[PDB]
């Protein structure tokens, strides 16, 4: 139940894990319902992430790194403004050292495929396709909405587009980066990103 | 024969259980007809419950959680009033631990499919489809009605829509939440929930 309880992804998590627990209990002081620590999900299946020049990248390649979701729009002027700063930040930070440390997975709030390909032609980091229901379940999970149109279960709109959210192993938000948030520090909230702590194990 | 004798789930339960009791009696001073203690029923069939993505979960998913039915109507002002408090209670109560505590099923007293889906878009918990006869069977089981339209057998209305009913494994009325009852704690009665002793075991 992190960071929300009413998520479709959290409901999917509860389903898988508790199914597994019941079958194990049928086979054999095992806790029903299972603990949130003990619950595990597969977040990005093998066909989710695609890299530069369209080659399939599994979840295995995200290990030991700081991973952030970039909820972005194509025609949003704030997105168009935020993009070059994040590009420069990504480049400089990855050159600056032995290891590649950060990664960005792009979640699109574009209208259609033409807008998707037109915007994604710039970016060198990983991107999730628009047709895959992941791009909406992640959106509902991390509470992103351009406009109040999603049926939203007494949530607040946690952020408006653009936003970057550092994700943990078990789907918890590691930290909110405040572009359009409580701090309202546009294009300089990037520097608040710590990468020691927020490792995708 | 709880909470009432004359309810559809109890009559199906009686039929099925003593059908099996005569089968094993023929196959073999086992007591006929079997005790309410000896009986077992499957409440929600394989295809009843569905989550936010309209993907079906079995009944055995509910084991170890305080589950409660929510009889709701789309257009009723009292339901419109009660919904945000119930949603906030769901939020905070399940968030505030490393374990799942409570779960809500949605039972619809609503008019038709379109309105049902529109109202069901607002809820982050499970639901039962309106065309499914299990909705009507559950209503007559728990004696909730919007007015005296379906016959009740010398009984009264237990309540009106909206109502929250904490249930057990076998159709036990574990406790009544006094929203519109003999006590009338509108939006305050939710705090009465004893999630500790009422486990869907």
């Amino acid at each position: 139940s992190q960071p929300v309880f009413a998520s479709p992804l959290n409901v999917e998590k509860r389903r898988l894990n508790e199914e597994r627990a019941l079958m194990q209990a049928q086979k054999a002081n095992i806790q029903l319902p299972p603990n949130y620590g003990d619950m595990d999900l597969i977040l990005f299946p093998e066909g989710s992430l695609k890299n530069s020049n369209n080659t399939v990248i599994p979840q295995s390649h995200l290990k030991g790194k700081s991973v952030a979701l970039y909820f972005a729009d194509g025609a949003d002027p704030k997105c168009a403004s935020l993009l070059p700063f994040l590009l420069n930040y990504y480049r400089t930070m990855n050159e600056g050292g032995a290891n590649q440390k950060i990664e960005i997975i792009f979640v699109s709030l574009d209208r259609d495929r033409e807008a998707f390909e037109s915007h994604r032609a710039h970016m060198p980091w990983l991107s999730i396709d628009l047709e895959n229901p992941l791009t909406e379940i992640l959106k509902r999970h991390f509470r992103v909405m351009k406009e109040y149109e999603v049926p939203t279960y007494g949530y607040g709109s946690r952020t408006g587009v653009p936003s970057v959210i550092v994700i943990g192993s078990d789907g918890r938000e590691a930290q909110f980066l405040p572009i359009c948030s409580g701090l309202e520090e546009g294009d300089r909230a990037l520097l608040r990103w710590d990468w020691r702590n927020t490792k995708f194990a | 024969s709880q909470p009432v004798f004359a309810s559809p789930l109890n009559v199906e339960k009686r039929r099925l259980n003593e059908e099996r009791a005569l089968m094993q009696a023929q196959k073999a001073n086992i007591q006929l007809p079997p005790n309410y203690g000896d009986m077992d029923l499957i409440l929600f069939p394989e295809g009843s419950l569905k989550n936010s993505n309209n993907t079906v979960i079995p009944q055995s998913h509910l084991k170890g959680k305080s589950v409660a039915l929510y009889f709701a109507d789309g257009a009723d002002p009292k339901c419109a009033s009660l919904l945000p408090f119930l949603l906030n209670y769901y939020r905070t109560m399940n968030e505030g631990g490393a374990n799942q505590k409570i779960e809500i099923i949605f039972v619809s007293l609503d008019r038709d499919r379109e309105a049902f889906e529109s109202h069901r878009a607002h809820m982050p918990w499970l639901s039962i489809d309106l065309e499914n006869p299990l909705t009507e069977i559950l209503k007559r089981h728990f004696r909730v009605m919007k007015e005296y339209e379906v016959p009740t057998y010398g009984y009264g209305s237990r309540t009106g829509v909206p109502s929250v009913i904490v249930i057990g494994s076998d159709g036990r009325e574990a406790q009544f939440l006094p929203i519109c009852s003999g006590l009338e704690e509108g939006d305050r009665a939710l705090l009465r929930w004893d999630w500790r002793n009422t486990k869907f075991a």
Binding site: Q2, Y148, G156, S157, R172, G182 | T92, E95, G96, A98
Partner: peptide
Amino acid sequence: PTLPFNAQSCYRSEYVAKPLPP
């Protein structure tokens, strides 16, 4: 037709039950 109310309090924004340190 309508444009929806969108704002919630500062208390509920940044005072929620955070998970405990290791």
